[PDB]
């Protein structure tokens, strides 16, 4: 349901997926430790550096 | 050059002036915490149509969007914020006497220090906005809608690692150069061997990569401007510092073995002019990028052009008489 | 967890030099029953990931198992060459997914399991080029080199990154091609073999890699231009495509063409007996890949010879049709 963003011609599916994941980590605040801990543990086990917004 | 004049009634020092895209409107901002909009009549006059408070600090710039996004203004401040403003027909409420029909749709707050410059992007990218600040960062924001100008996603933080004084977007609508931004620095340290840095949006890494840094600009920078592109295979860049400078930046064609990295430039200085005998405090180009203007502590706006041999010279001096 | 414990233990017993006095027996080597059990579980793992896409991904994407990094780490340890062979086959079955293969190519280049970067002080090679010439060539058995050829044989079907080795060396595949050509193929006939069949089991898995590399290469005008790359502050020429290198070695009087044609001679000579012999099915495939290489050269020769004429590159090459009429050095006739 990402239907509320006009298609700016310098993006791709990679960072709209990062944008959706950011939106979910801001939409579901009631348990937000577990969902940041989960995402960061999944990134670090794959060796992926963490975004400014996630930190 | 033929002059008309206007009493501007800002109640402290004015810091900036900017035209609309048609030259039918102009904006100005002050240490009195105000912005004003002035509009050019169907009789050749100019009238002040809005005059309102924008911020809590001194206002350090004012800038317009391109009119395919309507009538939108941005302003940056010493209170560490920037603000976005829309002109609205018919909203203006006598329930709150003396407010403007230029309404603040948002405030950006994420800079740790004074926001020194603000510039809207080349319209082909989207409704995008850049700001810079004395935390040594440039920040780039995107509106996902053109009507809901309250909502702006911060997409990039760009690390200069020196204080930021000014910024310039590259005016290339040509889909053979990737998106670019140049940044100037007010840093007075002798440790930072370069005061201008240049960044490229690299599709292969989706962040603003630092392509180049001008190792001949050892001295503090107050303003910076790319020249509008008449089809040129190379960019031109004006800088305001202890002197005026004009650089060329000509893209080095990648071999089919240098993937993933940014571009690189064959860079020259084409001109450097001391002739202000003083510091340079703005650099702005005519619509075709063929004439530069620059101001200094000599109380002169000086005009500069190429001759038919691309030898750049001074062509005019616009100066006060004090009568 | 068992593989991570073995990696942690074997990597801790590395000899710090200054300790020249009376050690006891180091009671920390994998026992034969643990080796046979690890082989059986690697063989189970390899069958599962050979068939299920979802099982390759959902093992490689695991935060705590990191199986590629643990297995490549164990290949750097002093473990038996049979256990290294089943580890390499497990990587070859993982390397069927192109996402895994692209990360595995970078991980192989970083781990130097083949030494692609040779340091000017270094009097002895490291990795599989020593294990082949000092371990397999003392056992008369070649399980590690065959499992490495099988790993490269899968990792070509998903393609290889054009930037492979960039910033460490000139980019491209040729260090792996030099090993497979000059240390495996050109030496498969001068080695001794405890299994008379294994001489042909080695020939199949190298000619398969060359066949894939020549099947999927198409000549481009770029191949005939020397592309320069900055390396540590010097401008160095990039490695040409492995298919360009294979075409150049088949369009000249090369030891690779001598070995190919003297495989076709030996193939007919064994077949004209009509007898059963050890490894017959592997000689028949090694002849099949050898014919299919020459056939792919003849199908691509004219285009390669025209792009060479347009580019003005100072190389000489002869039509394979003419080289096939060359005097066979064994029989002293034009009998190829």
The stretches of chain A forming alpha helices (DSSP H) are 13-27, 32-45
Residue B253 contacts C, CB cutoff 8 Å: no
Q: Kindly tell me the sign of the dihedral angle through the C-alpha atoms of C77, C78, C82, C85.
A: positive
CA distance C309 to C16: 58
Residue B255 contacts C, CB cutoff 8 Å: yes
CB B137 within 8 A of CB B159: yes
Q: Please indicate whether, in this complex, the C-beta atoms of B126 and A4 are within 8 angstroms of each other.
A: no
- Measured between beta carbons, which residues in chain B are less than 8 angstroms from residue C228? 255, 257
The stretches of B1-134 forming alpha helices (DSSP H) are none
- Measured between beta carbons, which residues in chain B are less than 8 angstroms from residue A49? none
The C-alpha angle with vertex C148 and arms to C145 and C149, in degrees rounded to 5, equals: 90
CA distances from B29 to B6, B121, B279, C107 (A): 15, 21, 22, 57
CA distance A46 to chain B (A): 18
Q: Which of B79, B182, B198 is nearest to B134 (CA)?
A: B79
Q: Which chains touch A (3 or more CB pairs under 8 A)?
A: B, C
Q: Write phi, then psi, for B250 (nearest 5 degrees).
A: -105, 115
CA distance B205 to chain A (A): 10
CA distance B136 to B113: 9
Q: Please indicate whether, in this complex, the C-beta atoms of A6 and B206 are within 8 angstroms of each other.
A: no
Residue B159 contacts C, CB cutoff 8 Å: no
Comparing alpha-carbon positions, the chain A residue that sits nearest to C69 is A46
CA distance B271 to B82: 34
The C-alpha angle with vertex C212 and arms to C210 and C213, in degrees rounded to 5, equals: 60
- In angstroms, the first-to-last Cα distance of chain B is 17
CB B170 within 8 A of CB B182: yes
CA distance B17 to B61: 8
Determination technique used: cryo-EM
The stretches of B60-108 forming alpha helices (DSSP H) are none
CA distance C327 to chain A (A): 57
Give B225's DSSP letter.
E
Under 8 Å CB pairs connecting chains B and C tally to 15
- Measured between beta carbons, which residues in chain C are less than 8 angstroms from residue A44? 63
C-alpha torsion C281→C286→C292→C294, nearest 10: -150
Q: Which residues of C136-169 are buried (b: 16+ CB within 10 A; e: fewer)?
A: bbeeebbbbbbbbbbbbbbbbebebbebbbbeeb
CA distances from B215 to B197, B271, C105, C230 (A): 9, 16, 38, 21
**How many other β-carbons are positioned within 10 Å of the β-carbon of residue B136?**
18
B251 sits in the region (left: phi over 0; alpha: psi -120 to 50; else beta) called beta
Q: Which of C98, C84, C12 is nearest to C42 (CA)?
A: C84
CA distance A23 to chain C (A): 24
Q: Which of B133, B204, B201, B213 is nearest to B169 (CA)?
A: B201
CA distance C180 to C89: 17
- Measured between beta carbons, which residues in chain A are less than 8 angstroms from residue C62? 45
CB C156 within 8 A of CB C209: yes
Residues 268-297 of B with CB under 8 A from C: none
Question: How many angstroms from the chain centroid is the CA of residue B186?
Answer: 15
Q: Burial, C259: exposed, middle or buried (Cβ in 10 Å; 0-12, 13-18, 19+)?
A: middle
Angle between helices A32-45 and A13-27 (to 10 degrees): 150
Give the three-class secondary structure for C289. helix
CA distance B156 to B161: 15
Comparing alpha-carbon positions, the chain A residue that sits nearest to C62 is A45
- Measured between beta carbons, which residues in chain B are less than 8 angstroms from residue A9? 124-126
CA distance B83 to B52: 13
Residues 230-249 of C with CB under 8 A from B: 238
CA distance B243 to C288: 75
Query: Quick one: tokens of C49?
Result: 């990931």
Residue of A5, A7, A10 to mutate, interface with B, max B Cβ within 10 Å = A10
CA distance C45 to C62: 15
CA distance C320 to C256: 13
- Measured between beta carbons, which residues in chain A are less than 8 angstroms from residue C66? 45
Question: How many angstroms from the chain centroid is the CA of residue B102?
Answer: 21
Q: Please indicate whether, in this complex, the C-beta atoms of C162 and B258 are within 8 angstroms of each other.
A: no
- In angstroms, the first-to-last Cα distance of chain A is 26
Q: Which residues of C307-329 are buried (b: 16+ CB within 10 A; e: fewer)?
A: bbeeeeeeeebeebeebbeeebe
Q: Please indicate whether, in this complex, the C-beta atoms of B256 and C227 are within 8 angstroms of each other.
A: yes
CA distance C29 to C35: 10
- Which residues pair with residue B16 across a beta bridge? B29
CA distance B278 to B299: 10
Q: Please indicate whether, in this complex, the C-beta atoms of A15 and B126 are within 8 angstroms of each other.
A: no
DSSP C124-166: S--BHHHHIIIIIHHHT--HHHHHHHHHHHHHTTT---TTTTT
Q: Which residues of B92-112 are buried (b: 16+ CB within 10 A; e: fewer)?
A: eeeeeeeebbbebbbebebbe
Q: Point out the residue among C162, C222, C228 whose CB comes nearest to the CB of B259.
A: C162
CA distance B105 to B152: 10
Q: Burial, B57: exposed, middle or buried (Cβ in 10 Å; 0-12, 13-18, 19+)?
A: middle
- Measured between beta carbons, which residues in chain A are less than 8 angstroms from residue B173? none
Q: Please indicate whether, in this complex, the C-beta atoms of B179 and A12 are within 8 angstroms of each other.
A: no
Q: Which helix (H) or strand (E) holds B214?
A: none
Give the three-class secondary structure for C204. helix
CA distance B290 to B300: 20
Give A31's DSSP letter.
G
- Measured between beta carbons, which residues in chain B are less than 8 angstroms from residue A10? 125-126, 179, 201, 203
Residues 43-62 of C with CB under 8 A from A: 61-62
Q: Please indicate whether, in this complex, the C-beta atoms of B144 and A52 are within 8 angstroms of each other.
A: no
Query: Which residues are CB-contacts of B182 (< 8 A; sequence separation ≥ 6)?
Result: B167, B168, B170, B196, B197, B198, B199, B224, B226, B237
Residue B256 contacts C, CB cutoff 8 Å: yes
CA distance C117 to chain A (A): 25
Q: Kindly tell me the sign of the dihedral angle through the C-alpha atoms of B214, B219, B220, B225.
A: negative
List the strands of the sheet with B180-184, edge to edge: B166-169, B180-184, B196-202, B207-213
Comparing alpha-carbon positions, the chain A residue that sits nearest to B146 is A6
Q: Point out the residue among B144, B157, B179 whose CB comes nearest to the CB of A6.
A: B144
- Measured between beta carbons, which residues in chain C are less than 8 angstroms from residue A41? 63
Q: Point out the residue among C61, C63, C66 whose CB comes nearest to the CB of A41.
A: C63
Residue C228 contacts B, CB cutoff 8 Å: yes
Query: Which residues are CB-contacts of A13 (< 8 A; sequence separation ≥ 6)?
Result: none
Give the three-class secondary structure for B272. strand
- Which residues pair with residue B27 across a beta bridge? B18, B37
B206 sits in the region (left: phi over 0; alpha: psi -120 to 50; else beta) called left
CA distance C161 to C108: 12
Q: Which of B139, B69, B126 is nearest to A6 (CA)?
A: B126
Q: Which chains touch C (3 or more CB pairs under 8 A)?
A: A, B
Query: Quick one: tokens of C241?
Result: 């495509």
Question: How many angstroms from the chain centroid is the CA of residue A30?
Answer: 17
Query: Quick one: tokens of C257?
Result: 């063409």
Residue C162 contacts B, CB cutoff 8 Å: yes
Residues of A with CB under 8 A from a CB of C: 41-42, 44-46
Q: Which chains touch B (3 or more CB pairs under 8 A)?
A: A, C
CA distance B71 to chain A (A): 19
Give C328's DSSP letter.
B
**How many other β-carbons are positioned within 10 Å of the β-carbon of residue C253?**
9
Residue of C4, C60, C61, C63 to mutate, interface with A, max A Cβ within 10 Å = C63
Comparing alpha-carbon positions, the chain C residue that sits nearest to A42 is C63
Query: Quick one: tokens of C98?
Result: 């192109």
CA distance B64 to B87: 11
- Which residues pair with residue B304 across a beta bridge? B292, B314
CA-derived radius of gyration, chain A: 13
Residue of C102, C162, C170, C223 to mutate, interface with B, max B Cβ within 10 Å = C162
- Measured between beta carbons, which residues in chain C are less than 8 angstroms from residue A42? 63
CA distance C104 to chain A (A): 13
The stretches of chain C forming alpha helices (DSSP H) are 2-12, 32-51, 53-60, 67-75, 81-94, 98-111, 128-131, 137-139, 143-155, 174-178, 198-216, 242-250, 255-271, 280-311, 320-323
Q: Which of C128, C57, C46, C127 is nearest to C89 (CA)?
A: C46
**How many other β-carbons are positioned within 10 Å of the β-carbon of residue C133?**
15
Comparing alpha-carbon positions, the chain B residue that sits nearest to C162 is B257
């Amino acid at each position: 349901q990402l239907s509320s963003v006009i298609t700016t011609k310098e993006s791709s599916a990679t960072d709209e997926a990062w944008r959706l994941l950011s939106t979910y980590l801001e939409r579901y605040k009631v348990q937000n430790n577990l969902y940041h801990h989960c995402v960061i543990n999944k990134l670090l086990s794959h060796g992926v550096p963490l975004p400014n917004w996630l930190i | 050059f033929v002059a008309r004049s206007i009493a501007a009634d800002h109640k402290d020092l004015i810091h900036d002036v900017s035209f609309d895209f048609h030259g039918r409107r102009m904006a100005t901002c002050s240490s009195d915490q105000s912005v004003k909009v002035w509009d050019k009549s169907e009789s050749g006059d100019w009238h002040c149509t809005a005059s309102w408070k924008t911020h809590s600090g001194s206002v350090w710039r004012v800038t317009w969007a391109h009119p395919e996004f309507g009538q939108v203004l941005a302003s940056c401040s010493f209170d560490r914020t920037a603000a976005v403003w829309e002109e609205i027909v018919g909203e203006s409420n006598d329930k709150l006497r003396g407010q403007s029909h230029w309404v603040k749709r948002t405030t950006l707050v994420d800079s740790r220090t004074s926001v020194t410059d603000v510039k809207f992007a080349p319209k082909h990218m989207g409704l995008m906005l850049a700001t810079c600040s004395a935390d040594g960062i440039v920040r780039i924001y995107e509106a996902p809608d053109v009507m809901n100008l309250s909502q702006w996603s911060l997409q990039h933080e760009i690390s200069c690692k020196l204080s930021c004084s000014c910024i310039s977007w590259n005016p290339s609508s040509s889909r053979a150069h990737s998106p670019m931004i140049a940044v100037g620095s007010d840093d007075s340290s002798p440790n930072a061997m370069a005061k201008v840095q240049i960044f490229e949006y690299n599709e292969n890494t989706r962040k603003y990569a630092k392509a180049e840094t001008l190792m001949t600009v050892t001295d503090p920078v107050h303003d910076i401007a790319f020249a509008p592109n008449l089809g040129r295979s190379f960019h031109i860049l004006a800088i305001a510092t202890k002197d005026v400078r004009i650089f060329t930046l000509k893209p080095v064609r990648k071999e089919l073995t240098s993937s993933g990295g940014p571009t690189k430039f064959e860079i020259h200085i084409v001109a450097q002019f001391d002739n202000h005998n003083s510091q340079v405090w703005r650099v702005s180009w005519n619509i075709t990028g063929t004439v530069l203007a620059s101001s200094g502590d000599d109380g002169c706006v000086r005009l500069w052009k190429a001759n038919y041999m691309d030898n750049w010279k001074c062509t005019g001096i616009l100066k006060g008489n004090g009568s | 967890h068992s593989l991570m414990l073995y990696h942690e233990h074997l990597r801790k017993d590395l000899p710090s030099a200054d300790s020249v006095q009376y050690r006891h027996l180091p009671s920390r080597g994998i026992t034969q029953k643990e080796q046979d059990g690890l082989i059986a579980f690697l063989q189970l793992t390899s069958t599962i990931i050979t068939w299920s896409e979802n099982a390759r991904l959902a093992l490689c994407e695991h935060p705590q198992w990191t199986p590629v990094v643990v297995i490549l780490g164990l290949l750097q340890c002093s473990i038996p060459p049979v256990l290294k062979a089943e580890l390499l086959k497990t990587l070859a079955a993982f390397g069927k997914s192109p996402e895994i293969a692209a990360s595995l190519w970078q991980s192989l280049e970083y781990t130097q399991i083949l030494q692609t970067v040779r340091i000017p002080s270094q009097r002895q090679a490291i990795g599989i080029e020593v294990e082949l010439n000092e371990i397999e060539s003392r056992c008369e058995e070649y399980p590690l080199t065959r499992a490495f050829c099988q790993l490269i044989s899968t990792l070509v079907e998903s393609s290889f990154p054009s930037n492979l080795g960039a910033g460490l060396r000139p980019p491209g595949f040729d260090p792996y091609l030099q090993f497979l050509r000059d240390s495996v193929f050109l030496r498969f006939r001068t080695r001794a073999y405890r299994r008379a069949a294994e001489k042909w089991e080695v020939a199949e898995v190298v000619l398969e890699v060359f066949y894939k590399l020549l099947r999927d290469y198409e000549p481009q005008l770029e191949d005939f231009v020397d592309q320069f790359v900055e390396l540590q502050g010097e401008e160095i020429i990039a490695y040409k495509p492995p298919g360009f290198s294979l075409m150049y070695h088949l369009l000249n009087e090369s030891p690779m063409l001598e070995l190919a044609l003297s495989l076709l001679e030996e193939g007919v000579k064994q077949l004209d007996t009509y007898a059963p012999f050890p490894g017959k099915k592997h000689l028949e495939k090694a002849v099949q890949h050898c014919l299919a290489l020459l056939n792919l050269t003849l199908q691509k020769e004219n285009l390669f010879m025209d792009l060479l004429r347009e580019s003005q590159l100072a190389l000489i090459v002869c039509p394979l049709e003419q080289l096939l009429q060359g005097i066979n050095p064994r029989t002293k006739k034009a009998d190829n």
